Scaffold this active site. Structure first.
Site, PDB file in Angstrom:
ATOM      1  N   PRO A 144      -4.861   1.952 -28.256  1.00 23.11           N
ATOM      2  CA  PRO A 144      -5.892   1.745 -27.067  1.00 23.11           C
ATOM      3  C   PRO A 144      -6.147   0.471 -26.571  1.00 23.11           C
ATOM      4  O   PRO A 144      -6.195   0.424 -25.335  1.00 23.11           O
ATOM      5  CB  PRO A 144      -7.356   2.353 -27.794  1.00 23.11           C
ATOM      6  CG  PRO A 144      -6.970   3.152 -28.817  1.00 23.11           C
ATOM      7  CD  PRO A 144      -5.590   2.241 -29.383  1.00 23.11           C
ATOM      8  N   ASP A 168      -1.607   7.923  -5.823  1.00 24.44           N
ATOM      9  CA  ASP A 168      -0.537   7.896  -4.598  1.00 24.44           C
ATOM     10  C   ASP A 168       0.578   8.356  -5.611  1.00 24.44           C
ATOM     11  O   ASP A 168       1.916   8.477  -4.854  1.00 24.44           O
ATOM     12  CB  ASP A 168      -0.388   6.439  -4.466  1.00 24.44           C
ATOM     13  CG  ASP A 168      -1.383   5.785  -3.489  1.00 24.44           C
ATOM     14  OD1 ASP A 168      -1.531   4.674  -3.217  1.00 24.44           O
ATOM     15  OD2 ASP A 168      -2.354   6.580  -3.267  1.00 24.44           O
ATOM     16  N   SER A 225      10.534   0.597 -20.119  1.00 28.27           N
ATOM     17  CA  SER A 225      10.901  -0.619 -20.418  1.00 28.27           C
ATOM     18  C   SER A 225      11.089  -1.477 -19.158  1.00 28.27           C
ATOM     19  O   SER A 225      11.015  -2.752 -19.155  1.00 28.27           O
ATOM     20  CB  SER A 225      12.279  -0.766 -21.399  1.00 28.27           C
ATOM     21  OG  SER A 225      12.326  -0.329 -22.468  1.00 28.27           O
ATOM     22  N   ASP A 262      12.093  -8.561 -27.480  1.00 29.76           N
ATOM     23  CA  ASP A 262      12.998  -7.556 -27.161  1.00 29.76           C
ATOM     24  C   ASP A 262      14.405  -7.825 -27.639  1.00 29.76           C
ATOM     25  O   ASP A 262      14.385  -8.522 -28.828  1.00 29.76           O
ATOM     26  CB  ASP A 262      13.290  -7.710 -25.623  1.00 29.76           C
ATOM     27  CG  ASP A 262      13.605  -6.334 -24.991  1.00 29.76           C
ATOM     28  OD1 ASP A 262      12.678  -5.446 -24.638  1.00 29.76           O
ATOM     29  OD2 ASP A 262      14.755  -6.140 -24.721  1.00 29.76           O
ATOM     30  N   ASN A 294      10.166   7.150 -23.081  1.00 31.50           N
ATOM     31  CA  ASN A 294      11.086   7.564 -22.341  1.00 31.50           C
ATOM     32  C   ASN A 294      11.173   9.132 -22.697  1.00 31.50           C
ATOM     33  O   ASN A 294      12.400   9.662 -22.475  1.00 31.50           O
ATOM     34  CB  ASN A 294      12.257   6.869 -22.060  1.00 31.50           C
ATOM     35  CG  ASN A 294      11.957   5.613 -21.443  1.00 31.50           C
ATOM     36  OD1 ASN A 294      11.126   5.315 -20.692  1.00 31.50           O
ATOM     37  ND2 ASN A 294      12.566   4.472 -22.126  1.00 31.50           N
ATOM     38  N   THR A 347       0.689  -1.145  -0.043  1.00 32.00           N
ATOM     39  CA  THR A 347       0.057  -0.212  -0.101  1.00 32.00           C
ATOM     40  C   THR A 347       0.788   1.273  -0.042  1.00 32.00           C
ATOM     41  O   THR A 347       0.375   2.164  -0.635  1.00 32.00           O
ATOM     42  CB  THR A 347      -0.776  -0.048   1.244  1.00 32.00           C
ATOM     43  OG1 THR A 347      -2.002  -1.062   1.180  1.00 32.00           O
ATOM     44  CG2 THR A 347      -1.645   1.197   1.432  1.00 32.00           C
ATOM     45  N   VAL A 393      -4.423  -2.132 -25.962  1.00 29.19           N
ATOM     46  CA  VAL A 393      -3.170  -2.730 -25.131  1.00 29.19           C
ATOM     47  C   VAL A 393      -2.922  -1.970 -23.891  1.00 29.19           C
ATOM     48  O   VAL A 393      -3.591  -0.895 -23.750  1.00 29.19           O
ATOM     49  CB  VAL A 393      -1.946  -2.944 -25.892  1.00 29.19           C
ATOM     50  CG1 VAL A 393      -2.547  -3.897 -27.409  1.00 29.19           C
ATOM     51  CG2 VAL A 393      -1.517  -1.468 -26.511  1.00 29.19           C
ATOM     52  N   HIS A 423      19.413  -5.840 -22.283  1.00 32.99           N
ATOM     53  CA  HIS A 423      17.894  -5.102 -21.914  1.00 32.99           C
ATOM     54  C   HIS A 423      16.928  -6.492 -22.174  1.00 32.99           C
ATOM     55  O   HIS A 423      16.172  -6.408 -20.998  1.00 32.99           O
ATOM     56  CB  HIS A 423      17.598  -4.379 -23.478  1.00 32.99           C
ATOM     57  CG  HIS A 423      16.459  -3.634 -22.975  1.00 32.99           C
ATOM     58  ND1 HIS A 423      15.109  -3.691 -23.648  1.00 32.99           N
ATOM     59  CD2 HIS A 423      16.261  -2.261 -22.230  1.00 32.99           C
ATOM     60  CE1 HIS A 423      14.380  -2.751 -23.426  1.00 32.99           C
ATOM     61  NE2 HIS A 423      14.808  -1.888 -22.547  1.00 32.99           N
ATOM     62  N   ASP A 447      -2.548   3.685 -19.002  1.00 31.33           N
ATOM     63  CA  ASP A 447      -3.390   2.696 -18.481  1.00 31.33           C
ATOM     64  C   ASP A 447      -2.969   2.471 -17.297  1.00 31.33           C
ATOM     65  O   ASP A 447      -3.659   2.165 -16.119  1.00 31.33           O
ATOM     66  CB  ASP A 447      -3.688   1.261 -19.027  1.00 31.33           C
ATOM     67  CG  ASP A 447      -4.104   1.334 -20.505  1.00 31.33           C
ATOM     68  OD1 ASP A 447      -3.427   0.740 -21.226  1.00 31.33           O
ATOM     69  OD2 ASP A 447      -5.109   2.168 -20.805  1.00 31.33           O
TER      70      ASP A 447
END
Length: 279
Positions: free
Chosen positions: A175, A260, A224, A39, A161, A16, A177, A69, A200
Site C-alpha cells: 500500500p 479519461d 514496466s 532492473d 502484466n 489534457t 508505494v 529492459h 494508485d
C-alpha cells in the site's frame, strides 16, 4: 520547454487529451533529483543519457545491461529524447539477470541497498526508485518496498502484466508505494495491465519508444514502461518543489487527469499521470 515529435507517452503526461505529439515541461527537468532504476542495469554509455547515468550496484558477474529492459526504463525516466525528467541523475542497480529474472532475496537486498546508498549521493531535490519488476505476492518483498519508501525515497512499482488484480503480486500490492497501471495511446487500459484497488495511478505503457542496449532504441509495452513515466514525473515534481518523496504518489493522484481511461474495472482508480505544466 517543448519537445516536438516527442514519444506519445511523453506528450500524454503533459496534455489534457490523447493524440498530441509535443511534450511540455519545466526546464528544471528534474535537475538536482536522483532516480534509482532497479532492473537489468543501464547502458550508461548511451548518448541519450549524456553521462547522467551510472551503475552503482550489481548482484551478478557484470553490471552491464545484457537485456535492454533496464536501459529502456531508464530511458523513459531521464534520457534526453525519451525521458520525463531530462536533467535527473540516474543510478542503475542490477537486480535482474540478462533474462530479466531475479530471486526475491536479491530484489530485497537491492531495495535495502538504495535506502542506504542515497546517503552516498548528492540529491538535494530528493530521491526516486523505479521498480519495473514483480511476481507473486510476498510480504517480505512488500515490506522491503515499504522500508525503501519509509527511508525517504519515492517508490514507483509496476502493477504487473497479468490482466488480473494486482493484490496477488509484489511489490505491486504494497500500500505505501506507488503502484502503476498501463494505458495505450487511445486512453484505453492496456490489454495486459493488472488492475485493482491497490493501483494508485496509470501511465503510458503501450508502444513506448525508449533507449535500448547497443546504443539503439525500440518500442515495447508493459507496466514496466508505465512505471518510469511516474518515477520521472515524481523526480520532476520534487525538483519543482511541489511535492516530496513521502507525498508524491498522493500528489500525482491529486493532480492526475481523472476519468479519461476506458476499460477501467469497477474498484480501480481512473487517473492518468499528468504534470500540469502551464507555459
Amino acid at each position: 520547454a517543448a519537445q516536438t515529435n516527442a514519444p506519445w507517452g511523453l506528450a500524454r503526461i503533459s496534455s489534457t487529451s490523447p493524440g498530441t505529439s509535443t511534450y511540455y515541461y519545466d526546464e528544471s527537468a528534474g535537475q538536482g533529483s536522483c532516480v534509482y532504476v532497479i532492473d537489468t542495469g543501464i547502458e550508461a554509455s548511451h548518448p541519450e543519457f549524456e553521462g547522467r547515468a551510472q551503475m552503482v550496484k550489481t548482484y551478478y558477474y557484470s553490471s552491464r545491461d545484457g537485456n535492454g529492459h533496464g536501459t529502456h526504463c531508464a530511458g523513459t525516466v531521464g534520457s534526453r529524447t525519451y525521458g520525463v525528467a531530462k536533467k535527473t541523475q540516474l543510478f542503475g542497480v542490477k537486480v535482474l539477470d540478462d533474462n530479466g529474472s531475479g530471486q526475491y532475496s536479491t530484489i530485497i537486498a537491492g531495495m535495502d541497498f538504495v535506502a542506504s546508498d542515497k546517503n552516498n549521493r548528492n540529491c538535494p531535490k530528493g530521491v526516486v526508485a523505479s521498480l519495473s519488476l514483480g511476481g507473486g505476492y510476498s510480504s517480505s518483498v512488500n515490506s522491503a518496498a515499504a522500508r525503501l519508501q519509509s527511508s525517504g525515497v519515492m517508490v514507483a512499482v509496476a502493477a504487473g502484466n497479468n490482466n488480473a488484480d494486482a493484490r496477488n503480486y509484489s511489490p505491486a500490492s504494497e500500500p505505501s508505494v506507488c503502484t502503476v497501471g498501463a494505458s495505450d495511446r487511445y486512453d484505453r487500459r492496456s490489454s495486459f495491465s493488472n488492475y485493482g484497488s491497490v493501483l494508485d495511478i496509470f501511465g503510458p505503457g503501450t508502444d513506448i519508444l525508449s533507449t535500448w542496449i547497443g546504443g539503439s532504441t525500440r518500442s515495447i509495452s508493459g507496466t514496466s514502461m508505465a512505471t518510469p513515466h511516474v518515477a520521472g514525473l515524481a523526480a520532476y515534481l520534487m525538483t519543482l518543489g511541489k511535492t516530496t518523496a513521502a507525498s508524491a504518489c498522493r500528489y500525482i493522484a491529486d493532480t492526475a487527469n481523472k476519468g479519461d481511461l476506458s476499460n477501467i474495472p469497477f474498484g480501480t482508480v481512473n487517473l492518468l499521470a499528468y504534470n500540469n505544466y502551464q507555459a
